[PDB]
Write a structure and sequence with these properties.
2 copies of one chain form a homodimer. With 204 residues, chain A is α+β, with helices and mostly antiparallel strands. Chain A has one domain: Pnp Oxidase, Chain A, CATH 2.30.110. The two termini of chain A are 24 Å apart. In chain A, 33% of the residues are buried. Chains A and B meet through strand 1, strand 2, strand 5, strand 6 and helix 3 of A and strand 1, strand 2, strand 5, strand 6 and helix 3 of B. Chains A, B: This is NimA-related protein. Chains A, B: It comes from Deinococcus radiodurans (strain ATCC 13939 / DSM 20539 / JCM 16871 / CCUG 27074 / LMG 4051 / NBRC 15346 / NCIMB 9279 / VKM B-1422 / R1).
């Protein structure tokens, strides 16, 4: 800043900057539904949070990382896991579920301590997960497996999925209600001009 | 198997195998507390799930990826985020929180469809998160920043953390009650001998 520079020799927010007119104007790093769709289609790992009744009677969430596939036409995401708690904190045959997919880039150094950050793109999906059965489960598993192992073909590369396979696996469909997407993927963190600049060891 | 082989020319579970006597005997892929400690110390990204009251009155979880640091002496993990919902589904000044840290390796192909899998190590930590203030927050942020940017020193590499910085950031301590660790990190998925073996394109 001038003020620091002049003091040494003895607001930014409203001053000139460049802006690409095609860049998202949405606040709080939020993204468009199309961007969310694309991120979910190219991802293969998610975390799913579901609620279980705990020792104090109170619901609490588990977080499980797992393979998933987004089926946009059906409006769902499929996955499988045999992780459970005792009782789910939920009335009915389906349960509420939150699913998160992210891309995590690099940690971005700065000489300003609260500008230290990590590049990320992250979606939360809110919906209801139900257990699938029979050909519904076999088809979901197939889509999942062929998505996360591109070129693999169930029934050729692998033996077909048997009735025993299905009896031993819990296969879920998370039917999407709502979603929320966020991106903060700058090439460089914001720096403080009035503190010594980071050395070459950081940004080089 | 003999039976398939003989049929072509016309249980495993109890038969011979090798075992390393030093390998964990814990069921369901579970790990020791020391292993959990080490995984939390070497990680830098976590997901935190906390509960918020939704439109139907019902609690539901958010999942937020973020930088964290484990402070084993204090018995907590620290992080910062300004993500909120409307009201937390929680009585009091702290809130229950679940924190997950994983290492995700490679997808492991197989000619047996339910042996398809992904290498992972994953910890859930269950505890209570409270907002920190003043020098408690400044110290937590400092530990966090110096952990995830090794060699960076707050106050030297960066300007010091100011009172303004703190007023604009929500800094949390998640005080650990319990934790659960899981590893499935095989070099190769289990294959089915009685189906054509995967080609060189998969395991080579």
């Amino acid at each position: 800043s001038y003020y620091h520079h002049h003091h040494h020799h003895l607001s930014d927010f409203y001053d000139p900057r460049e802006r690409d007119p095609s860049v998202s104007r949405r606040p709080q790093n939020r993204q468009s539904d199309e961007w969310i769709r694309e991120l979910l289609l190219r991802g293969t790992i998610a975390r799913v949070a579901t609620l279980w009744q705990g020792e104090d009677g109170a619901a609490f969430p588990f977080i499980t990382p797992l393979a998933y596939a987004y089926r946009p036409e059906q409006g769902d995401l499929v996955y499988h896991t045999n992780v459970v708690g005792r009782l789910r904190a939920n009335a009915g045959q389906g349960h509420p579920a939150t699913l998160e997919v992210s891309e995590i880039g690099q940690f971005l150094p700065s000489n300003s301590p609260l500008e230290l950050s990590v590049q990320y793109r992250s979606v939360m999906v809110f919906g209801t997960a139900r257990v699938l059965a029979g050909e519904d489960a076999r088809a979901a598993l197939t889509t999942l497996s062929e998505r996360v192992f591109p070129g693999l073909k169930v029934g050729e590369t692998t033996r077909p999925i048997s009735e025993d396979d299905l009896k031993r696996t819990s296969v879920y469909s998370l039917s999407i209600d709502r979603w929320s997407g966020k991106e903060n993927w700058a090439e460089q963190a914001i720096q403080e001009e009035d503190w010594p600049a980071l050395g070459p060891e950081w940004l080089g």
